[PDB]
Design a protein that fits this description.
The complex is a heterodimer of chains A (227) and B (9). Chain A is mainly α. Chain A has helices spanning 4-11, 16-28, 32-53, 62-88, 104-131, 136-147, 156-177, 184-189, 191-211, 219-225; strands spanning 93-95, 101-103. By secondary structure, chain B is mostly helical. Chain B has one helix at residues 2-8. Classes of the chains: A mainly alpha (227), B mainly alpha (9). Bound molecules: ligand RJW. Chain A: A phospholipid derivative binds at residues 112-115, 205, 209.
Chain lengths: 227, 9
């Protein structure tokens, strides 16, 4: 069965069709890279609301809420992207938060050499998570582990306690629901440092483009880059 | 801060 803790995490998940329709409208309302900056900016709004909605997170005071989000926003962006490929993804395509399916080689061209490399690394993680049978229960657990980081507080006791209970619930779930997949718990946690390295490289690239004058007006994205 | 504005709403 599913631990009750994970059932509460699943309740915080955004309504996927409504998020798609909303970001779709925003983009329909400029380089392709510039359009993706807009798409990421809108995704960050959805991420902030997700955490704001969230059990546990909504108990922290604003100052603590800001630190956690400033520390993991890009990691959550990449993790969300990766899981989106795991579920809705196909070979040689990229699925966007707007619901669009684009050919990888086309969007990789538009992304340039550097970004294509990071996108390709992420696709490697997609393939590994698929072979591990990564599912939605495990996904929401990783999202909260990324959000409630210990490497970041007025209430470190809450953060530490959330981290320990989510870890225990994820171990219980993977052991009980994928017992033939040996060490699935550890194999999932291994990907968090990998995703974080990708997100650090992504931030440095976007920060470079911003200083270079290539990132159009996106106040939330830019503010998080300056955090 | 826009982020702080979002969290205070
Ligand atoms: C962090 C990104 C990004 C932000 C601003 C500009 C460009 C990318 C993402 C993460 C998921 C989507 O929001 C973004 C879209 C995407 C892949 C398509 C890039 C096409 C550019 C013309 C991102 C991504 C995914 C994996 C590794 C690095 C970036």
């Amino acid at each position: 069965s599913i631990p009750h803790l994970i059932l509460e995490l699943l309740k915080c998940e955004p309504d996927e069709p409504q998020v798609q329709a909303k970001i779709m409208a925003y983009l329909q309302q400029l380089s392709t890279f510039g359009l993706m900056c807009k798409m990421a900016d809108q995704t960050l709004f959805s991420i902030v609301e997700w955490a704001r909605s969230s059990i546990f997170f909504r108990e922290l005071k604003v100052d603590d809420q800001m630190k956690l989000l400033q520390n993991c926003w890009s990691e959550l962006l990449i993790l969300d992207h990766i899981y989106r490929q795991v579920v809705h993804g196909k070979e040689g395509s990229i699925f966007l938060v707007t619901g669009q399916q684009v050919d990888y080689s086309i969007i990789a061209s538009q992304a340039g050499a550097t970004l294509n490399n990071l996108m390709s690394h992420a696709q490697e993680l997609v393939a590994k998570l698929r072979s591990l049978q990564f599912d939605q229960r495990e996904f929401v657990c990783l999202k909260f582990l990324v959000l409630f980081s210990l490497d970041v507080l007025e209430n470190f006791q809450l953060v530490e306690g959330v981290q320990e209970q989510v870890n225990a619930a994820l171990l219980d779930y993977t052991m009980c629901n994928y017992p033939q997949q040996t060490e699935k718990f550890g194999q999932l946690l291994l990907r968090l440092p990998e995703i974080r390295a990708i997100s650090m490289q992504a931030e440095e690239y976007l920060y470079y483009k911003h200083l270079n004058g290539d990132v159009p007006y996106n106040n939330l994205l830019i503010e998080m880059l300056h955090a | 801060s826009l982020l702080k504005k979002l969290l205070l709403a």
